[PDB]
Write a protein that binds this ligand. Structure first.
Ligand SMILES: [Zn+2]
Ligand SMILES: [Zn+2]
Length: 41
């Protein structure tokens, strides 16, 4: 599966992976909660 950030998976909107914060989190203003799930684990 692809990654998705922690709020984007909860609303179930398409995560974007724009650095720094997504198009979602810019617009709602949850850029603070914008972190993509790590691929190391
Ligand atoms: Zn996202
Ligand atoms: Zn995000």
């Amino acid at each position: 599966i692809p990654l998705s950030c922690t709020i984007c998976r909860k609303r179930k909107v398409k995560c974007d992976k724009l650095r720094p914060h997504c198009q979602q989190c810019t617009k709602t203003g949850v850029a603070h909660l914008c972190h993509y799930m790590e691929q190391t684990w």
